[PDB]
C-alpha cells in the first residue's frame, strides 16, 4: 500500500462542515467536487476540469452531490433545500426539486429513485422521472441526516443522523425503520454497505463516539464495534481486498484501512493537515479520494 496519494487536487473553499457530502466518484470515472457554491467535475482519465454549475443566489452553497448509477446525471443538494438534477453530458439542470424545509446534506440513488436527507431530519424519495417527484417521506431522525446510503441490492436504505441514530429502512412501505441502532454516541455520517454481503452495514460515529460498527441489518446484531480513536466521517468497503477504509479527524487526520472480518488495522494513510470530510471510491475500486478541510482532495491508489 503506497504511503503517498497518487494525486492531490486543490479543493479551494471546500466547506468545512462535517455533515455535508461534497464528493462523489461516478461510474464514468468523473469526480464531482462541491466547492462552496460551485460543483466541479474532474475526469480521472483526462484530468479535464469543468465548473458544472454555480449557485445563483447569495449565501447559497452546495450541501451534497451524488451520481446516479449510470453516471450521466448528478444530483446536487443545496443549502436552499433544493435537490437539483444535472445532466452532465448536456451540462444543464434538468430539475430543481423542492420538498425539503432545510439544506439537503445527504443523497443516495436507488435506480431512478433519488433519496435526499435534510438538516430537518427528514428523508425524501424522489422519482426523478415524474412531475411530482416527492413520492415518500421517511421520518426517523430529529436532527440532520448526514449519512444516506442505499444498499447495492436495493433491499434496504441506511441513514445516519446528528441525533446519533442509524435507521435501516425498507425499500417499500408504512414508512417505519426495520432497524434503529442507537449505540453510536455521536453523529453518524459514515454509512457503507458491504458489497459482498447484502445485509452487512458499516457505520461510523463522530468525535463523541469514534467507533466503527458493523451490523447485520436482518438480525439487528452488531457484529463488531471498533474504536478508531477519532471521528469517523466516512467508510468505504473494497470489494476486491475484503477490507474497509475509514476517514478521520483529530488528531492524525488519516485514513485507516482495516482487514475484514478481523477488523485488524492494515495501514494508515497520513498526509492531510486538517480533518477528513469525505471519502469516495473510484469505479474500479482501486482509488479512494479523500476530501479534507485542508482544501485538498487526496487520491490514494490504496486498493491496487
Amino acid at each position: 500500500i503506497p504511503s503517498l496519494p497518487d494525486r492531490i487536487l486543490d479543493a479551494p473553499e471546500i466547506r468545512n462542515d462535517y455533515y455535508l457530502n461534497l464528493v462523489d466518484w461516478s461510474s464514468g470515472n468523473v469526480l464531482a467536487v462541491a466547492l462552496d457554491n460551485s460543483v466541479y467535475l474532474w475526469s480521472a482519465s483526462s484530468g479535464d476540469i469543468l465548473q458544472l454549475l454555480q449557485m445563483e443566489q447569495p449565501g447559497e452553497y452546495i450541501s451534497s452531490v451524488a451520481w446516479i448509477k449510470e453516471g450521466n446525471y448528478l444530483a446536487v443538494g443545496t443549502s436552499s433545500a433544493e435537490v437539483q438534477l444535472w445532466d452532465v453530458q448536456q451540462q444543464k439542470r434538468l430539475r430543481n426539486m423542492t420538498s425539503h424545509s432545510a439544506r439537503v446534506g445527504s443523497l443516495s440513488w436507488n435506480s431512478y429513485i433519488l433519496s435526499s436527507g435534510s438538516r430537518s431530519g427528514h428523508i425524501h424519495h424522489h422519482d426523478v422521472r415524474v412531475a411530482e417527484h416527492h413520492v415518500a417521506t421517511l421520518s426517523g431522525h430529529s436532527q440532520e441526516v448526514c449519512g444516506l446510503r442505499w444498499a447495492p441490492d436495493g433491499r434496504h436504505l441506511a441513514s445516519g443522523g446528528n441525533d446519533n441514530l442509524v435507521n435501516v429502512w425498507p425499500s417499500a412501505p408504512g414508512w417505519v425503520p426495520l432497524q434503529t441502532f442507537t449505540q453510536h454516541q455521536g453523529a453518524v455520517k459514515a454509512v457503507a454497505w458491504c458489497p459482498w454481503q447484502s445485509n452487512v452495514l458499516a457505520t461510523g460515529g463522530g468525535t463523541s463516539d469514534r467507533h466503527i460498527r458493523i451490523w447485520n441489518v436482518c438480525s439487528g446484531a452488531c457484529l463488531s464495534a471498533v474504536d478508531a480513536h477519532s471521528q469517523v466521517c466516512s467508510i468505504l468497503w473494497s470489494p476486491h481486498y475484503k477490507e474497509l477504509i475509514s476517514g478521520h479527524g483529530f488528531a492524525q487526520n488519516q485514513l485507516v484501512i482495516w482487514k475484514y472480518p478481523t477488523m485488524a488495522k492494515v495501514a494508515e494513510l497520513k498526509g492531510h493537515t486538517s480533518r477528513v470530510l469525505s471519502l469516495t471510491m473510484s469505479p474500479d475500486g482501486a482509488t479512494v479520494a479523500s476530501a479534507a478541510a485542508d482544501e485538498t482532495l487526496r487520491l490514494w491508489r490504496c486498493f491496487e
Binding site: 486543490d10 479543493a11 479551494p12 466547492l35
Partner: peptide
C-alpha cells in the same frame, strides 16, 4: 485553480 479549483481541482488543479
Amino acid at each position: 485553480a479549483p481541482x488543479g
